[PDB]
Write a protein that holds these residues in place. Structure first.
Motif, PDB file in Angstrom:
ATOM      1  N   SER A 159       0.826  -1.204   0.000  1.00 24.93           N
ATOM      2  CA  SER A 159       0.000   0.000   0.000  1.00 24.93           C
ATOM      3  C   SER A 159       0.863   1.257   0.000  1.00 24.93           C
ATOM      4  CB  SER A 159      -0.941  -0.010   1.204  1.00 24.93           C
ATOM      5  OG  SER A 159      -0.222   0.140   2.415  1.00 24.93           O
ATOM      6  N   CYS A 161       4.143   1.561  -0.817  1.00 24.59           N
ATOM      7  CA  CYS A 161       4.969   1.666  -2.016  1.00 24.59           C
ATOM      8  C   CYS A 161       4.137   2.086  -3.221  1.00 24.59           C
ATOM      9  CB  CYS A 161       5.681   0.342  -2.291  1.00 24.59           C
ATOM     10  SG  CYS A 161       4.667  -0.905  -3.115  1.00 24.59           S
ATOM     11  N   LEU A 162       2.901   1.590  -3.318  1.00 25.12           N
ATOM     12  CA  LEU A 162       2.021   2.025  -4.398  1.00 25.12           C
ATOM     13  C   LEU A 162       1.551   3.459  -4.199  1.00 25.12           C
ATOM     14  CD1 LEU A 162      -0.057  -1.179  -5.174  1.00 25.12           C
ATOM     15  CD2 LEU A 162       1.489   0.054  -6.702  1.00 25.12           C
ATOM     16  N   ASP A 163       1.496   3.931  -2.951  1.00 28.03           N
ATOM     17  CA  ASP A 163       1.143   5.327  -2.713  1.00 28.03           C
ATOM     18  C   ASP A 163       2.280   6.261  -3.113  1.00 28.03           C
ATOM     19  OD1 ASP A 163      -1.464   4.924  -1.809  1.00 28.03           O
ATOM     20  OD2 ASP A 163      -0.809   4.570   0.255  1.00 28.03           O
ATOM     21  N   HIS A 165       4.879   5.492  -5.216  1.00 30.68           N
ATOM     22  CA  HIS A 165       5.071   5.376  -6.656  1.00 30.68           C
ATOM     23  C   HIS A 165       3.900   5.970  -7.426  1.00 30.68           C
ATOM     24  CE1 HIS A 165       7.862   2.264  -5.101  1.00 30.68           C
ATOM     25  NE2 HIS A 165       8.594   2.614  -6.144  1.00 30.68           N
ATOM     26  N   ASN A 166       2.712   6.006  -6.820  1.00 34.91           N
ATOM     27  CA  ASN A 166       1.547   6.563  -7.497  1.00 34.91           C
ATOM     28  C   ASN A 166       1.526   8.085  -7.424  1.00 34.91           C
ATOM     29  OD1 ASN A 166      -0.836   6.721  -8.891  1.00 34.91           O
ATOM     30  ND2 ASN A 166      -2.044   5.514  -7.434  1.00 34.91           N
ATOM     31  N   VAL A 169       3.688   8.915  -9.979  1.00 34.58           N
ATOM     32  CA  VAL A 169       2.964   8.957 -11.245  1.00 34.58           C
ATOM     33  C   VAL A 169       2.278  10.307 -11.414  1.00 34.58           C
ATOM     34  CG1 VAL A 169       1.030   7.967 -12.521  1.00 34.58           C
ATOM     35  CG2 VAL A 169       2.702   6.466 -11.438  1.00 34.58           C
ATOM     36  N   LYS A 170       1.749  10.866 -10.323  1.00 37.70           N
ATOM     37  CA  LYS A 170       1.265  12.240 -10.377  1.00 37.70           C
ATOM     38  C   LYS A 170       2.410  13.204 -10.666  1.00 37.70           C
ATOM     39  CE  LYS A 170      -2.937  11.005  -9.297  1.00 37.70           C
ATOM     40  NZ  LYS A 170      -4.051  11.108 -10.280  1.00 37.70           N
ATOM     41  N   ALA A 171       3.597  12.913 -10.126  1.00 33.77           N
ATOM     42  CA  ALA A 171       4.793  13.711 -10.362  1.00 33.77           C
ATOM     43  C   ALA A 171       5.378  13.509 -11.753  1.00 33.77           C
ATOM     44  CB  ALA A 171       5.853  13.392  -9.305  1.00 33.77           C
ATOM     45  N   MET A 172       4.836  12.585 -12.545  1.00 38.76           N
ATOM     46  CA  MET A 172       5.165  12.483 -13.960  1.00 38.76           C
ATOM     47  C   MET A 172       3.980  12.824 -14.849  1.00 38.76           C
ATOM     48  SD  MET A 172       5.197   8.419 -14.929  1.00 38.76           S
ATOM     49  CE  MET A 172       5.155   8.741 -16.690  1.00 38.76           C
TER      50      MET A 172
ATOM     51  N   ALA D  76       8.330   8.229 -17.960  1.00 39.91           N
ATOM     52  CA  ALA D  76       8.630   9.578 -17.491  1.00 39.91           C
ATOM     53  C   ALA D  76       9.857  10.185 -18.161  1.00 39.91           C
ATOM     54  CB  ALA D  76       8.823   9.572 -15.973  1.00 39.91           C
ATOM     55  N   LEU D  80       9.694  14.108 -18.885  1.00 40.48           N
ATOM     56  CA  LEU D  80      10.544  14.879 -17.989  1.00 40.48           C
ATOM     57  C   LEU D  80      11.846  15.332 -18.638  1.00 40.48           C
ATOM     58  CD1 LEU D  80      10.019  12.922 -14.645  1.00 40.48           C
ATOM     59  CD2 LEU D  80       8.912  15.023 -15.443  1.00 40.48           C
TER      60      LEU D  80
ATOM     61  N   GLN E 124      -8.632  -1.074  -1.499  1.00 38.09           N
ATOM     62  CA  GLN E 124      -7.378  -0.549  -2.027  1.00 38.09           C
ATOM     63  C   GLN E 124      -7.332  -0.658  -3.545  1.00 38.09           C
ATOM     64  OE1 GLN E 124      -4.118  -2.461  -0.017  1.00 38.09           O
ATOM     65  NE2 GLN E 124      -4.263  -1.147   1.797  1.00 38.09           N
ATOM     66  N   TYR E 128      -6.996   2.143  -6.345  1.00 34.32           N
ATOM     67  CA  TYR E 128      -6.005   2.040  -7.410  1.00 34.32           C
ATOM     68  C   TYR E 128      -6.618   2.384  -8.760  1.00 34.32           C
ATOM     69  CZ  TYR E 128      -3.117  -0.337  -3.934  1.00 34.32           C
ATOM     70  OH  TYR E 128      -2.385  -0.649  -2.812  1.00 34.32           O
ATOM     71  N   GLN E 131      -7.053   6.426  -8.291  1.00 29.01           N
ATOM     72  CA  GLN E 131      -5.880   7.275  -8.477  1.00 29.01           C
ATOM     73  C   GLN E 131      -5.204   7.010  -9.817  1.00 29.01           C
ATOM     74  OE1 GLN E 131      -3.347   6.716  -5.078  1.00 29.01           O
ATOM     75  NE2 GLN E 131      -4.743   7.757  -3.660  1.00 29.01           N
TER      76      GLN E 131
END
Lengths: 183, 70, 93, 95, 136, 53
Positions: A159, A161-163, A165-166, A169-172, D76, D80, E124, E128, E131
């Motif tokens: 949970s 790590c997916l948060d 990395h996700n 994903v918003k940061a990309m 990315a 980027l 979750q 997923y 998001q």
């Protein structure tokens, strides 16, 4: 030139847990000279000799003890035995009255189980306090969660790590918007 | 801010003014045998090296006498 | 007993059939030889695990319990459908 | 899908339970024993043996985690990079 | 507090040495050092401190992960006055066996049915799809 | 003019805010049309064919 303070205090507060990682992957001639006086004692932490290293500290100690109020080093002077008994927790289970007690510079039946019990009440280790003939045993099961409740073990790892990395994903996703914003 | 690094660099200048090229050459006596070597292994080799520097440095020559006594 | 540790032991079989412990193996062997039960027990100490079986006559407490467990399954599937579909329809559609 | 089974089961077991008590003219009650039998062929398994199966399916979940994070991290690259090399060059060459 | 005011009096270094012994937890050194305090009239207050930490020392020594025998509690615990075995029988509320202290409810918790964590795993997964596919 | 820019600007706040769900609809629908036309031009390519040079 500036990371020697966060790294210095970093390893100073890391050697409290018994495991002190030295300078391995960073090569710069600033943290070396900064660590030269501290190297003998930060290497002397793991061996844990009370009487000798107690004199070694104040012997040549000028700057790391002249930094002020000697708080964490005056806690280290009695934390040497706690990191040493934590190395005993990383050692075998059975505790003898002469071999390992004489090895730990503490030869007495009461304070042995008393201070070892003070290491058990911390909660960072696992032991089985049993008294059958007078010897103190311990199960010292440090087996990792492999085939021992794995879903609940790395569930929060998946949970989290997916948060991270996700949100990466918003940061990309957002910087491309900040790219196409002008055109 | 990058402006607070100046007094820390002054402290580094004081540490360099304590001994003038004394730790560079004295420590260079071992660095000449440590140069170009992976410093990741030098932590373990220096750990066991400094650990055995007090006593029982080699200990392999003593096992031949410890076989019959132990 | 449909649920709640269906696993049992030979003490109830020997007690209900007034037979010794030496003949329960031939009893379950005959039970598997007839073909009305497929029960295979992986036990070490003597235990009796059973499988699919047919009443073939009647059971009223299993009709009422059938309504209880059936309504429970239905309201649980409905609860999961409203729970997942509630926000799932609002965020995905 | 939960509504696709909910309307069927909910639509059937109501008239079924009605014909249980208010039923006559034999409706082939013999097949009801197989009905409740198959319904009782899943007696709420304790999931003790399937834990390792949850470790396998959750390990495949971890594989999908590494594939998503790593592959998206590869995607990315062009974004980027072009976000910088296009904006700074178009800006420095605009005037 | 290390302002380098006196640094030679026993009362200046007394609280930091007693607190460092508290970090060690060794009570034998404090009991044997009880008569080391000078005529300074705060020895009764030190006894008040021992009276307010005896619940934590006795509570930690009586944690009873697996089991402990009375023959160690005779030396570790206080004098033969039966105040601990009386007050702790109404405070802890445990069983008293044949001259032994039994420990129950230790690692007896049954693991989960894996049903609820599967439901929160489904939630979750909903987050997923949320998001991962929200802006789309 | 000085104080009227607030409430006059609120109309631009609503007119620009209303475009959010609109561009959401376009970005969620035009990609569905993109896979519709994509699979439509993909299914044109059939296996039975003649081989030339």
């Amino acid at each position: 030139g500036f990371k020697q303070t966060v790294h210095k205090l970093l390893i100073v507060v890391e050697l409290l847990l018994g495991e002190i990682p030295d300078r391995l992957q960073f090569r710069q001639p600033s943290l070396k000279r900064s660590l030269m006086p501290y190297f003998l004692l930060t290497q002397a932490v793991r061996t844990g000799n009370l009487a000798k290293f107690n004199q070694v500290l104040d012997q040549f100690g000028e700057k790391f003890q002249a930094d002020g109020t000697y708080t964490l080093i005056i806690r280290l002077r009695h934390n040497v035995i706690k990191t040493g008994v934590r190395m005993i927790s990383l050692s075998y289970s059975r505790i003898s009255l002469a071999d390992i007690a004489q090895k730990l510079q503490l030869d007495s039946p009461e304070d042995a189980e008393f201070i070892v019990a003070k290491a058990i009440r911390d909660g960072v280790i696992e032991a089985s306090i049993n008294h059958e003939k007078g010897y103190v045993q311990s199960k010292e099961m440090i087996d990792i969660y492999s085939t021992r409740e794995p879903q609940l073990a790395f569930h929060q790892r998946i949970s989290f790590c997916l948060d991270i990395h996700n949100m990466s994903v918003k940061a990309m996703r957002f910087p491309p918007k900040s790219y196409n914003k002008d055109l | 801010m990058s402006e607070k690094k100046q007094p820390v660099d002054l402290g580094l200048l004081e540490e360099d003014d304590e001994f003038e090229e004394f730790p560079a050459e004295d420590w260079a006596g071992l660095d000449e045998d440590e140069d170009a070597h992976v410093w990741e292994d030098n932590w373990d080799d220096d750990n066991v090296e400094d650990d055995f520097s007090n006593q029982l440095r080699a200990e392999l020559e003593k096992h031949g006498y410890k076989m019959e006594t132990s | 007993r449909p649920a709640n540790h269906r696993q049992l032991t030979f003490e109830e079989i020997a007690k209900s059939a007034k037979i010794t412990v030496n003949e329960v193996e031939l009893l379950v062997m005959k039970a598997l030889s007839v073909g009305l039960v497929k029960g295979s027990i992986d036990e070490v100490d003597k235990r009796v695990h059973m499988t699919w079986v047919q009443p073939r006559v009647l059971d009223l407490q299993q009709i009422k319990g059938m309504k209880d467990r059936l309504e429970f399954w239905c309201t649980d599937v409905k609860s999961m459908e409203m729970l997942v579909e509630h926000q799932a329809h609002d965020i995905l559609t | 899908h939960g509504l696709k089974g909910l309307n069927s089961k909910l639509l059937d077991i109501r008239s079924y339970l009605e014909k249980v008590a208010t039923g006559k003219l034999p409706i082939n009650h013999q097949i009801i024993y197989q009905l409740q039998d198959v319904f009782n062929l899943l007696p709420d398994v304790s999931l003790q043996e399937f834990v390792k199966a949850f470790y396998l399916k959750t390990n495949d979940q971890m594989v999908v985690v590494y594939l998503a994070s790593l592959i998206r991290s590869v995607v990315a690259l062009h974004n980027l990079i072009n976000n910088k090399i296009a904006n700074r060059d178009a800006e420095k060459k605009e005037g | 507090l290390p302002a380098k005011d006196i640094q030679t009096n026993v009362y200046i270094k007394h609280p930091v040495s007693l607190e460092q012994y508290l970090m060690e937890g060794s009570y034998n050194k404090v009991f044997l050092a009880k008569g080391n305090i000078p005529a300074e009239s705060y020895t009764f207050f030190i006894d008040i401190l021992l009276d307010t930490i005896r619940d934590e020392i006795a509570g930690c020594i009586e944690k009873a992960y697996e089991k402990i025998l009375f023959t160690e509690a005779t030396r570790i615990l206080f004098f033969n006055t039966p105040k601990k075995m009386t007050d702790y029988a109404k405070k802890r509320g445990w069983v008293l066996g044949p001259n032994n202290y039994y420990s129950f409810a230790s690692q007896q918790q049954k693991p989960e049915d894996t049903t609820i964590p599967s439901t929160e795993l489904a939630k979750q997964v909903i987050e997923y799809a949320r998001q991962l596919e929200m802006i789309v | 003019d000085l104080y009227s820019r607030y409430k006059k600007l609120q109309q631009e706040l609503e007119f620009l805010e209303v475009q959010e769900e609109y561009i959401k609809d376009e970005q969620k629908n035009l990609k569905k049309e993109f896979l519709h036309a994509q699979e439509e031009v993909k299914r044109i390519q059939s296996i039975p064919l003649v081989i030339g040079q």
